[PDB]
Design a protein around this ligand. Structure first.
Ligand SMILES: CCCc1cc(F)ccc1[C@H](O)c1ncc[nH]1
Ligand code: NA
Length: 567
C-alpha cells in the first residue's frame, strides 16, 4: 500500500458485477454503495444513472476506477464539510488521514461522526486509547479484520497493516508452541490427572450423595469441590489431544470456550469451596451450633450462590474470541494465544481483580481458619493429656505435696475440657442434652476431685491416693468415651493444613501470580518472557483435583471407608 486509493482497493476489492457485500447491501466496483433495499432492480436503477448508461449489471474495468476516484473525492468533501470530522482530519498525518477516509468510505460521513470520543482521542494524538475505543463497536463486530487494519493504521501511523498480513506470534511464544514442553510434558501430566482425578472425585461425589447419611455442611462443600473437579477433568481427553497435535484446536470456538470456562471455574470454585470448608470446620470447633438440617440447607444455598457468581465472573472468558489461526505455525490455538492484543488492558485488570478478591482474600480466611482450628484442637489435646498424666502421678506419689499438687492441676484440666467441644458432638449445640451430659460427666469427676482434695488438705495422705482409683473409674465411664480419639483428630487437622498449603503452593499461587505477570508484560511490551512459566503454572494448577481426594480423606469419615475398602 502507498496511498488512500491503494488502501481502499485492498479492503473493498474489485468486482465488475453487482454483488451483495458482507451485510447484504448491493454494491459494485470498488466499494461503491448502490442502495440499501433487498431489490436487485432497485440497485440497477441507481447504477444506471451513476454511470450514465445501462450497464445491465456489468460495468467495465475502466468505469470502476472513474467511479471509485469520485467516491474518494466525495468522502473527503464530506469530512471537511463536517464540523466534527474537519478538525480531527486537519490534525492527522497523511497516513492516518487515509484511515479516517477509509472509515468514511465504508460507514459514510454521518456514521464516522458518531465516534465522538475516539475522534477526540485521535485529535489529542492518543493512538492506543483511540484504538481500544474503536475495538469495541459494531464496526469491529461486523467487520473485525477490516476494522483491525484501519485501527492499526491509526495506532501505528504506517501502511504496515496493508503491506504485511498476520503470519505469526512473537518468537518466544512460537518456540514454546512448537516445543516439547507443550506437546509432550503437558499431555502427560494432563493424562495422569485424568486417570487419577476422574475416578477418585467420581467416587467421592458418589459417597457424598448416596453413602453419606449425615449431610453436614462439610459434605456439601466437598461435593461441589468434587463436582468442580469432575466438570473440568471430563474435558481433558480433548485437552490432551489438543497438545499432542501441536496445540491445534479443531473442535470449534464454542467448545474451546467451554473448556476455558470450566477450567477457570474449577480454579476459583476450588479456592472458594476450600475457604467455606475450612472456615466451617473451624467454626464448628470454636463456636458450634445445633441445626444440622438447617445449616445444611444454608450451605447448599451458599454453593448455588458461589456457582452463579463464578458463572457471572467468567463471562469475559466465555464471550470473547479465544481461538486464532497462526499461519506460520499452521495451528489453531485455544486460550494459549490472545486473538485480540487490544484487550490486554481489560485482561490485566480482570485477572488482578480475581488474584486479590478471589485468591488472596480467600487465602487469608483459609489460613487463619486452620490457625484457630489447630490451636483449639491442641488445647483440648493438652487437657486430656494433663488429666491422664496427673492422675497417673497420684498413684505413684508418696508425699502429701505431690498428691495435693496433682489434684489441683487435674482439677483445672477438667474444668477447661468441660468448656471444650468433644470430638463426637460436633453438630450438637452447647445447650443440647448430649452436651449437658458431657459437662455433667465432669461435674461428677470434679466433685470427686474435691473429695480427694478434702483429704489432701486434711493431712490424710494415703486416703487421698485411694480416691485416685475412684477417679479412674469416673474417667473411663463418663469422660474417656468422649476424648478417646481427640489426639488422632488433631493429627488429621494438621495433615489437612499441610494438604491445603501444598495445593496453594503448587496450584493456586503460581497460577494467579503469573496470570497477573503474564498480561502485565503483554500490556507493557507486547510480549512476556514468563510465557513458559505461565504455561507450566496453568498445568500444575490442574493438580488440585489430584490433591482434592486427600482433603476428603481427612474431613469425611465416610469417604475413608470407601477409600480403604477399595484398596
Ligand atoms: C484447549 C484448552 C487450552 C487451555 C485452556 C485453559 F483454560 C487453560 C489451559 C489450557 C492449556 O491446556 C494450557 N495448559 C497450560 C497452558 N495452557
Ligand atoms: Na478442585
Amino acid at each position: 500500500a502507498s496511498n488512500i486509493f491503494e488502501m481502499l482497493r485492498i479492503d473493498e476489492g474489485l468486482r465488475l458485477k453487482i454483488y451483495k457485500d458482507t451485510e447484504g447491501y448491493y454494491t459494485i466496483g470498488i466499494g461503491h454503495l448502490l442502495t440499501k433495499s433487498p431489490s436487485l432492480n432497485a440497485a440497477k436503477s441507481e447504477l444506471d444513472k451513476a454511470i450514465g448508461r445501462n450497464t445491465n449489471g456489468v460495468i467495465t474495468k475502466d468505469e470502476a476506477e472513474k467511479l471509485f476516484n469520485q467516491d474518494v473525492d466525495a468522502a473527503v468533501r464530506g469530512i471537511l464539510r463536517n464540523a466534527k470530522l474537519k478538525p480531527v482530519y486537519d490534525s492527522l498525518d497523511a497516513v492516518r488521514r487515509a484511515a479516517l477516509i477509509n472509515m468514511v468510505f465504508q460507514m459514510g460521513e454521518t456514521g464516522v461522526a458518531g465516534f465522538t470520543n475516539s475522534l477526540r482521542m485521535l485529535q489529542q494524538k492518543r493512538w492506543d486509547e483511540a484504538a481500544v475505543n474503536l475495538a469495541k463497536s459494531r464496526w469491529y463486530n461486523q467487520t473485525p479484520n477490516r476494522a483491525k487494519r484501519v485501527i492499526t493504521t491509526f495506532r501505528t501511523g504506517t501502511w504496515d497493516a496493508y503491506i504485511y498480513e498476520f503470519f505469526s506470534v512473537d518468537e518466544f511464544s512460537a518456540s514454546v508452541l512448537t516445543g516439547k514442553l507443550t506437546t509432550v510434558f503437558l499431555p502427560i501430566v494432563y493424562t495422569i490427572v485424568f486417570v487419577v482425578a476422574l475416578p477418585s472425585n467420581g467416587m467421592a461425589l458418589w459417597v457424598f450423595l448416596f453413602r453419606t447419611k449425615k449431610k453436614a455442611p462439610a459434605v456439601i462443600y466437598m461435593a461441589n469441590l468434587a463436582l468442580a473437579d469432575l466438570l473440568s477433568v471430563i474435558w481433558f481427553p480433548l485437552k490432551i489431544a489438543y497438545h499432542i497435535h501441536g496445540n491445534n484446536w479443531i473442535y470449534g470456538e464454542a467448545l474451546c470456550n467451554v473448556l476455558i470456562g470450566f477450567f477457570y471455574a474449577n480454579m476459583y470454585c476450588s479456592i472458594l469451596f476450600l475457604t467455606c470448608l475450612s472456615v466451617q470446620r473451624a467454626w464448628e470447633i470454636v463456636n458450634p451450633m445445633g441445626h444440622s438440617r438447617k445449616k445444611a440447607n444454608i450451605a447448599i444455598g451458599i454453593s448455588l450462590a458461589i456457582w452463579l457468581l463464578i458463572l457471572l465472573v467468567t463471562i469475559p472468558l466465555y464471550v470473547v474470541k479465544q481461538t486464532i489461526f497462526i499461519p506460520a505455525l499452521q495451528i489453531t490455538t485455544c486460550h494459549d494465544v490472545l486473538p485480540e492484543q487490544l484487550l490486554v488492558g481489560d485482561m490485566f485488570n480482570y485477572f488482578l481483580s480475581l488474584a486479590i478478591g478471589v485468591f488472596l482474600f480467600p487465602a487469608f480466611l483459609t489460613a487463619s481458619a486452620y490457625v484457630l482450628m489447630i490451636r483449639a484442637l491442641a488445647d483440648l489435646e493438652d487437657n486430656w493429656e494433663t488429666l491422664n498424666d496427673n492422675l497417673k502421678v497420684i498413684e505413684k506419689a508418696d508425699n502429701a505435696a505431690q498428691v495435693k499438687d496433682a489434684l489441683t492441676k487435674m482439677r483445672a484440666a477438667a474444668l477447661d475440657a468441660q468448656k471444650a467441644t468433644p470430638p463426637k458432638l460436633e453438630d450438637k449445640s452447647p445447650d443440647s442434652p448430649e452436651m449437658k451430659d458431657f459437662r455433667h460427666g465432669f461435674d461428677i469427676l470434679v466433685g470427686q476431685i474435691d473429695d480427694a482434695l478434702k483429704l489432701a488438705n486434711e493431712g490424710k495422705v494415703k486416703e487421698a491416693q485411694a480416691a485416685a482409683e475412684q477417679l479412674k473409674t469416673t474417667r473411663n465411664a463418663y469422660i474417656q468415651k468422649y476424648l478417646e480419639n481427640s489426639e488422632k483428630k488433631r493429627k488429621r487437622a494438621i495433615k489437612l493444613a499441610v494438604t491445603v498449603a501444598a495445593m496453594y503452593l503448587i496450584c493456586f499461587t503460581p497460577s494467579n501470580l503469573l496470570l497477573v505477570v503474564h498480561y502485565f508484560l503483554i500490556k507493557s511490551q507486547g510480549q512476556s518472557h514468563v510465557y513458559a512459566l505461565y504455561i507450566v503454572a496453568l498445568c500444575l494448577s490442574t493438580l488440585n483435583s489430584c490433591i482434592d481426594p486427600f482433603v476428603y480423606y481427612f474431613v469425611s469419615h465416610d469417604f475413608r471407608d470407601h477409600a480403604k475398602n477399595a484398596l
